[PDB]
Design an enzyme around this catalytic site. Structure first.
Site, PDB file in Angstrom:
ATOM      1  N   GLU A  91       0.871  -1.202   0.000  1.00 55.05           N
ATOM      2  CA  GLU A  91       0.000   0.000   0.000  1.00 55.05           C
ATOM      3  C   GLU A  91       0.904   1.248   0.000  1.00 55.05           C
ATOM      4  O   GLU A  91       2.013   1.152   0.418  1.00 55.05           O
ATOM      5  CB  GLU A  91      -0.967  -0.061   1.201  1.00 55.05           C
ATOM      6  CG  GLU A  91      -1.852   1.175   1.442  1.00 55.05           C
ATOM      7  CD  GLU A  91      -2.877   1.483   0.353  1.00 55.05           C
ATOM      8  OE1 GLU A  91      -2.481   1.534  -0.799  1.00 55.05           O
ATOM      9  OE2 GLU A  91      -4.058   1.684   0.662  1.00 55.05           O
ATOM     10  N   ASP A  92       0.402   2.366  -0.510  1.00 52.04           N
ATOM     11  CA  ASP A  92       1.202   3.616  -0.633  1.00 52.04           C
ATOM     12  C   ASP A  92       1.392   4.260   0.749  1.00 52.04           C
ATOM     13  O   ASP A  92       2.514   4.590   1.092  1.00 52.04           O
ATOM     14  CB  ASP A  92       0.574   4.605  -1.643  1.00 52.04           C
ATOM     15  CG  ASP A  92      -0.850   5.005  -1.364  1.00 52.04           C
ATOM     16  OD1 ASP A  92      -1.392   4.453  -0.439  1.00 52.04           O
ATOM     17  OD2 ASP A  92      -1.388   5.860  -2.081  1.00 52.04           O
ATOM     18  N   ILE A  93       0.310   4.451   1.494  1.00 52.04           N
ATOM     19  CA  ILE A  93       0.395   5.210   2.769  1.00 52.04           C
ATOM     20  C   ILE A  93      -0.618   4.727   3.804  1.00 52.04           C
ATOM     21  O   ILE A  93      -1.691   4.329   3.399  1.00 52.04           O
ATOM     22  CB  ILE A  93       0.234   6.734   2.515  1.00 52.04           C
ATOM     23  CG1 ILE A  93       0.565   7.573   3.762  1.00 52.04           C
ATOM     24  CG2 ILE A  93      -1.149   7.090   1.967  1.00 52.04           C
ATOM     25  CD1 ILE A  93       0.866   9.059   3.457  1.00 52.04           C
ATOM     26  N   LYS A 113       2.296   8.000   7.956  1.00 48.64           N
ATOM     27  CA  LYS A 113       2.059   9.353   8.516  1.00 48.64           C
ATOM     28  C   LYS A 113       1.556   9.108   9.945  1.00 48.64           C
ATOM     29  O   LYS A 113       0.360   8.976  10.140  1.00 48.64           O
ATOM     30  CB  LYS A 113       1.070  10.135   7.658  1.00 48.64           C
ATOM     31  CG  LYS A 113       0.895  11.602   8.046  1.00 48.64           C
ATOM     32  CD  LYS A 113      -0.229  12.311   7.269  1.00 48.64           C
ATOM     33  CE  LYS A 113      -0.099  12.194   5.756  1.00 48.64           C
ATOM     34  NZ  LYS A 113      -1.153  13.000   5.061  1.00 48.64           N
ATOM     35  N   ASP A 157      -2.471   6.447   6.969  1.00 46.95           N
ATOM     36  CA  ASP A 157      -2.714   7.809   7.499  1.00 46.95           C
ATOM     37  C   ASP A 157      -3.737   7.649   8.644  1.00 46.95           C
ATOM     38  O   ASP A 157      -3.304   7.461   9.771  1.00 46.95           O
ATOM     39  CB  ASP A 157      -3.069   8.725   6.309  1.00 46.95           C
ATOM     40  CG  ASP A 157      -3.139  10.205   6.643  1.00 46.95           C
ATOM     41  OD1 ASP A 157      -3.284  10.518   7.808  1.00 46.95           O
ATOM     42  OD2 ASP A 157      -3.063  11.028   5.723  1.00 46.95           O
TER      43      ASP A 157
HETATM   44  O1  LIG Z   1      -0.785  12.259   2.168  1.00 47.48           O
HETATM   45  C1  LIG Z   1      -1.422  11.830   1.330  1.00 47.48           C
HETATM   46  N1  LIG Z   1      -1.037  12.053   0.009  1.00 47.48           N
HETATM   47  C2  LIG Z   1      -1.844  11.515  -1.044  1.00 47.48           C
HETATM   48  N2  LIG Z   1      -3.028  10.742  -0.716  1.00 47.48           N
HETATM   49  C3  LIG Z   1      -3.417  10.512   0.677  1.00 47.48           C
HETATM   50  C4  LIG Z   1      -4.463   9.845   1.310  1.00 47.48           C
HETATM   51  C5  LIG Z   1      -5.624   9.084   0.640  1.00 47.48           C
HETATM   52  N3  LIG Z   1      -5.259   7.729   0.195  1.00 47.48           N
HETATM   53  C6  LIG Z   1      -5.434   6.549   1.066  1.00 47.48           C
HETATM   54  C7  LIG Z   1      -4.423   5.408   0.759  1.00 47.48           C
HETATM   55  O2  LIG Z   1      -4.232   5.371  -0.640  1.00 47.48           O
HETATM   56  C8  LIG Z   1      -5.496   6.912   2.565  1.00 47.48           C
HETATM   57  C9  LIG Z   1      -5.181   5.758   3.506  1.00 47.48           C
HETATM   58  P1  LIG Z   1      -5.966   6.088   5.127  1.00 47.48           P
HETATM   59  O3  LIG Z   1      -7.342   5.622   5.088  1.00 47.48           O
HETATM   60  O4  LIG Z   1      -5.191   5.278   6.001  1.00 47.48           O
HETATM   61  O5  LIG Z   1      -6.088   7.512   5.386  1.00 47.48           O
HETATM   62  C10 LIG Z   1      -4.227  10.025   2.669  1.00 47.48           C
HETATM   63  N4  LIG Z   1      -3.142  10.725   2.847  1.00 47.48           N
HETATM   64  C11 LIG Z   1      -2.644  11.039   1.678  1.00 47.48           C
END
Ligand SMILES: O=c1[nH]cnc2c(CN[C@@H](CO)CCP(=O)(O)O)c[nH]c12
Ligand SMILES: O=c1[nH]cnc2c(CN[C@@H](CO)CCP(=O)(O)O)c[nH]c12
Lengths: 216, 213
Positions: A129-131, A162, A133
């Site tokens: 997964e990318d991030i 994050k 948060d």
């Molecule tokens: O910082 C960021 N830059 C660009 N996009 C995002 C996002 C939205 N995307 C998803 C995962 O793809 C959130 C995962 P979560 O549910 O854990 O918040 C949250 N932060 C950022």
């Protein structure tokens, strides 16, 4: 790399200006070193493990090209990260195969694209997964994969954590980079699909989040 | 420089790594990356002068820009590694673009999510043209559903000796022998995609992993 600000106060990395950026988080060299170090951790962790044998119909067998580690990559944010990670996993000799899923929110979660793998019962599964948060997206994906595929084990590797954004408990097993509590762009991160192709990760100037309102 | 040799088992070794499933080496990582970057420069040089429908300002026609980027449709799963590399080279050359995906299988498994391609320049990124049938299917579908201003195709690999229908991509990074290729995105039941080099597969090894994933 050379990171500085020009006479307009705009961040310049290797001669290229990024007027949408507030701060630089990581250069390409730092990101790539961080991914390769996590690839070594993943390979060291899974290389000695065994799981369901679907190649010989046998009971259990070591992770191998016959019975590879199952990787589910979360589109679209993870595709560039996944492309680089799989090549480092190959460098360390880890047998693995990759399928893709996509989720979105309406906030409540919904699956946009299902995986096509159908024999994950009793297999080791790693989510790329990318991030992380808030933690809500991965809570939803883990619960769904766990109940629908019944894997032997289920772990998560994120390009970015994050820490301050958490609203539900979620600590990925593997984390390549830690980012500030700001909106990040670059290296797969974007604003309406813009900035994904940057080789570096940056924080976004707050006024730029609504720069491209038109749906694609 | 890459070191290419054979071990006592007759197996190809590139930079100390053995490839027992390979018949011959087609291209090293260094050659592949040089070829992709060269085509990125051609793609950026060709599209940056063009204009298309303005959806940022509503209308009418406007230059390709971060406001109205080139639309790229990447074919999953085969083109994902090639796309990740190509988009970064396109960024290097300053081409404004955005990427969406379609997924095909051997049926359409996943549709594009983009909904405003009418009157837009659209570029398809695909791993290989061999028989030409996959791209004839994708091109007809994209044209009929999206009504683009122009529709072009960039392939990582052209196997010119395999054609069964007319299909000439607009951009071609590499020419491959009339053999089954593996590596750099190319696979046998999802195996071998992570190799940094492209090889030909030993005959009969396309049946090495019969179990469905
Ligand atoms: O910082 C960021 N830059 C660009 N996009 C995002 C996002 C939205 N995307 C998803 C995962 O793809 C959130 C995962 P979560 O549910 O854990 O918040 C949250 N932060 C950022
Ligand atoms: O050599 C190869 N190595 C690995 N896979 C393939 C494929 C199958 N895939 C599609 C597109 O991905 C073929 C395109 P076409 O419809 O033009 O035949 C053909 N040749 C090879």
């Amino acid at each position: 790399h050379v990171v500085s600000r020009n006479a307009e106060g705009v961040i310049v990395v290797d001669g290229k200006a990024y007027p949408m950026a507030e701060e630089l988080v990581a250069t390409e060299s730092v990101i790539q070193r961080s991914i390769k170090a996590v690839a070594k951790q993943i390979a060291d962790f899974y290389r000695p493990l065994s799981h369901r044998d679907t190649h010989g119909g046998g009971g259990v067998a070591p992770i191998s090209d016959e019975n590879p580690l199952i990787i589910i990559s979360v589109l679209k944010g993870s595709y560039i990260f996944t492309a680089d990670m799989v090549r480092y996993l190959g460098d360390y000799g880890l047998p693995h195969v990759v399928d893709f899923l996509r989720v979105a929110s309406y906030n409540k979660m919904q699956l946009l694209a299902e995986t096509q793998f159908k024999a994950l019962r009793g297999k080791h599964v790693l989510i790329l997964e990318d991030i992380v948060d808030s933690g809500k997206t991965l809570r939803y994906i883990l619960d769904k994969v766990q109940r629908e595929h019944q894997p032997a084990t289920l772990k998560v590797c994120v390009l970015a954590d994050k820490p301050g954004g958490r609203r539900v408990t979620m600590q990925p097993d593997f984390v390549c980079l830690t980012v500030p509590n700001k909106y990040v762009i670059g290296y797969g991160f974007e604003v309406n699909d813009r900035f994904r192709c940057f080789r570096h990760i940056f924080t976004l100037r707050p006024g730029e989040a609504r720069r491209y309102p038109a749906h694609l």
